Amino acid sequence: DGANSDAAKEYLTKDSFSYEVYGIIAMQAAYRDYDSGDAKQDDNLGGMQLNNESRIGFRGKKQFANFEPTFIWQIEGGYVDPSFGGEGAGLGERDTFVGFESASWGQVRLGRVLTPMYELVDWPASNPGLGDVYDWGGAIGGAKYQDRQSNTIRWDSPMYADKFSIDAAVGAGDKAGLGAGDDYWGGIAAHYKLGPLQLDAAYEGNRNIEAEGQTWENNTYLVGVQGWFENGISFFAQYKYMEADASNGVNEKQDAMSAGLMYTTGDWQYKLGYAANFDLERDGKTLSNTSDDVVSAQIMYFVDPSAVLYARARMNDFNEGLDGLDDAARWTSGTNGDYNEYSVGVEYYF
Amino acid sequence: DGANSDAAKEYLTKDSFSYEVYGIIAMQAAYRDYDSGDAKQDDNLGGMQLNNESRIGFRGKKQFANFEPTFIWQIEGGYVDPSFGGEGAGLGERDTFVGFESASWGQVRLGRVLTPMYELVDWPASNPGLGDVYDWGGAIGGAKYQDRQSNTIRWDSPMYADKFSIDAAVGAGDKAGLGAGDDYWGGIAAHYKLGPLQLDAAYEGNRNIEAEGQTWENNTYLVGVQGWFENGISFFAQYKYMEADASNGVNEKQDAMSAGLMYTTGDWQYKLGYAANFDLERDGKTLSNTSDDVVSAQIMYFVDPSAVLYARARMNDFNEGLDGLDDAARWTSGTNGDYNEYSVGVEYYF
Amino acid sequence: DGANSDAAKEYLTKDSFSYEVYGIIAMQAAYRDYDSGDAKQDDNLGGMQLNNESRIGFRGKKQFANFEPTFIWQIEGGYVDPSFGGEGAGLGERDTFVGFESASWGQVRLGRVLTPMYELVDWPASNPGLGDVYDWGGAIGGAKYQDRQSNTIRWDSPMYADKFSIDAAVGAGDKAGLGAGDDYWGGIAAHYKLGPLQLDAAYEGNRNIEAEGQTWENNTYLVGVQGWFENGISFFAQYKYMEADASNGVNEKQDAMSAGLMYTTGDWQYKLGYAANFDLERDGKTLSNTSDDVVSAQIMYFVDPSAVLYARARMNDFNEGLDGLDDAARWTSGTNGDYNEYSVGVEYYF
């Protein structure tokens, strides 16, 4: 089977030992206390779980004899036993790609990677534990952006003048990746280092998204700043603007923000985070109680150059629900209800 | 994505080459002869299969610079192609955990591990081929015990005075691990070395088990002995007592036993095994024909220090069926009918 | 759980470092242009995808102290992100076996391997991109052959007199592997190297195949020739004859062929391929328009001893459909409709 059967194994010279095994060992013991309005649902969803986000990966680089740009590849496994999921992950569930790099024009990757917009949403703005609100939270229809996405081509520019970089990507959408749709998206992000500050801007457009009986277009915009000061204080702040248009003329808009404050001293880092989605507006009308927010606190100990220990507490306050354009409830990260979470964890890199 | 995204890869110093790849290569060619009472069911269930229980694992240890107890981790894949199943296993389907160890207080593991009770049920008492009766066999409702279980914290004591050790564990149940329940369980085992003998006792309690339209509590108790004699004879014997209470007032009790005899000489080991479940009692009344038993013989050849070859033959005689508390047939390991199995196998450890 | 619990890990001497990690990094960017007769279906199925056929494997050999023939084993992962599928593959989805080998009598493998017949169908006769027609295409009922198959024992002879080799195999069927049937199959292939030519012949019989409310018997025969000339010209040609007999007395026949021409000069290889399935005959009557064919062109660049780059174009013309013996449509590789495909790709072996 496959594009060339096992011919590579029969005719090519094996490049023995040209790989690296790597892994992130990551365990979070997390107790969730839900307040959904239903005592049984709270008992099911809440309680103590172990969130095992350990993963194994393989990666390598190769200088082909007949081609100047260096070939790069990566295959990274999924989380081996996350909370709320069964055990076991396949290889290739996380960033998994081939590509080429050259110091002059940067790096082009093909495969499964983070979109330029999602990368900024994810880090720094989803940490610590802000992601239920800022990453995959929100009430807007269609697809505000992809996150980790297969069938993508992504270009990461060089760091021009040691100060300015661009990431650009296009790819197939989720249904298109199964031969079940013709959705697609394109995106671009830019970063500018201004001394102790970094400026970020990003865009993503999704097209031909099928949902709630309509076809959707989404456009999402993001601006952010990150900074670190000499007294050990650092911060980030991000503003995010989401627009969606359905094929029946319905328009939706929602915006969001995320901010974080960190104090690093010695082997310790203290962190506070806040994120909110504001009320969704549909066809000029504000939908009441469609906002979300989360406040988070974290203390982290640099127990080793390769590892951290941390404790975290957060409070999620979600929207009360809304209907999509087909008169059914629209799923959001608030569907299961509000909760608080107390957790301790370890992360280790080999 | 995740509790801390890809921050570990970005900010931590990679602890290169600090891992081990290990594996058990295990293949059993097994012919089954079923006598279910339906000739077509016999043809489907029976016949020759290959039972590929090979698996790959990763593990390592790390002395963190700022923390005295040693960090340990393991990620083990599932069986790559077992009999009666499709091919392919993910990483993390078997014992997969992080933990800490210190010579004074032993070892604590968090993740997916064997329960204290199941570890004794599994070894030595399920071997060779006694498991259909003694491990997952039985007629009792609820969950008599978990076996390999995610969302567990397990403490293994040191071997005090070269004689006495304890294993204790608590964890979330199966539905709770999907956010769909609040089942939980706790267990404890103790081992006492009296020269050539070892004494074993174990307990497990499961709570809030949802099954057959009821909520269940289970309590399971186990006592056993194992012995090694230098004329080459070794043996084990176990008695197991299981009780279950449903929320509609039903009580069930069942007990079981397992015994094995071994003669080891040179590169050879002969083994006989026997296990039985006795009649289930429901509400003080014994249910007739709800018992099971199995007799097994095995010859094992130590073909290498790292590997064994073995041949095995066993006869399973199962219960004749019983209803659960929702007036439908209760699934047991006897549902598919009686069978004999003849097999040869290899196991190899790298 | 398992035939021997975790006893290997507790009692056997670990053969550390007796393993190899290997991989094929394989990425194909493929644009599909469908002409199915329905514009929506054309839009869903067609478009650009990445076909990531990268996979990771583990393999090794061990000379047992007490056994002459060398022990061999392999565990190979599946495709990490193929087109039309989700991401993630388990270990063991591809060739995964244990076995023994000796220079005198060849090699026996137990586990998941290609059948002798399928190996010739796959390479050379399905390349480049002829497989939709010649590999899993075709309209005949039952199972014309297995491809990669679990529960197999396969014997590969030595190359006698440097000229003649045999592969023979038997195994359980797909439902038998789940204990849901008693299908099985046997096959044999032979190869003869006569100067610049290689001659190939193969047979496979499948029995007790359940499909379309019937039980099927299949017999498939194959003859082929491959040639390599010193001026850089090479070719292959293969003929395939398939017969099937259903348990209600219906008989079916179909034949097929595949041919390819290659010109290799320096670091370049040009390739043209053609394959066709001819009209199916059912109970002596030809069913019109049940034939398929494909024409394909490829240019391949040997970018490295370990890697190739290639570009490829093909046009698939499929049958218009047919009913099975239960009066429902019989699925074939033409069910989704005709299409053209343009692609570029890379393959790399480490």
Ligand SMILES: CN[C@@H]1[C@@H](O)[C@@H](O[C@@H]2[C@@H](O)[C@H](O[C@H]3O[C@H](CN)CC[C@H]3N)[C@@H](N)C[C@H]2N)OC[C@]1(C)O
């Ligand atoms: C849980 N039963 C599994 C069965 O689902 C399958 O293994 C799946 C595997 O096929 C899935 O992968 C498959 O389905 C994915 C969506 N869930 C998309 C990718 C696809 N290859 C993995 N995500 C999980 C394994 N347990 O085959 C092995 C098994 C044990 O029988």
Ligand SMILES: CCCCCCCCOCCOCCOCCOCCO
């Ligand atoms: C210290 C380990 C020695 C274990 C030896 C094996 C013991 C075999 O005992 C079997 C007893 O037979 C049980 C009959 O059923 C008992 C009914 O009472 C329990 C209620 O279910």
Ligand SMILES: CCCCCCCCOCCOCCOCCOCCO
């Ligand atoms: C060394 C032998 C070289 C082989 C060349 C002979 C093969 C030529 O036969 C081609 C026959 O094709 C005729 C029609 O193909 C089948 C119908 O097409 C299906 C359209 O749906």
Ligand code: NA
């Ligand atoms: Na719960």
Ligand code: NA
């Ligand atoms: Na989990």
Ligand code: NA
């Ligand atoms: Na997506």
Ligand code: NA
């Ligand atoms: Na069978």
Ligand code: NA
């Ligand atoms: Na199997």
Ligand code: NA
């Ligand atoms: Na369980």
Ligand code: NA
């Ligand atoms: Na499409």
Ligand code: NA
């Ligand atoms: Na895919």
Ligand code: NA
């Ligand atoms: Na098959």
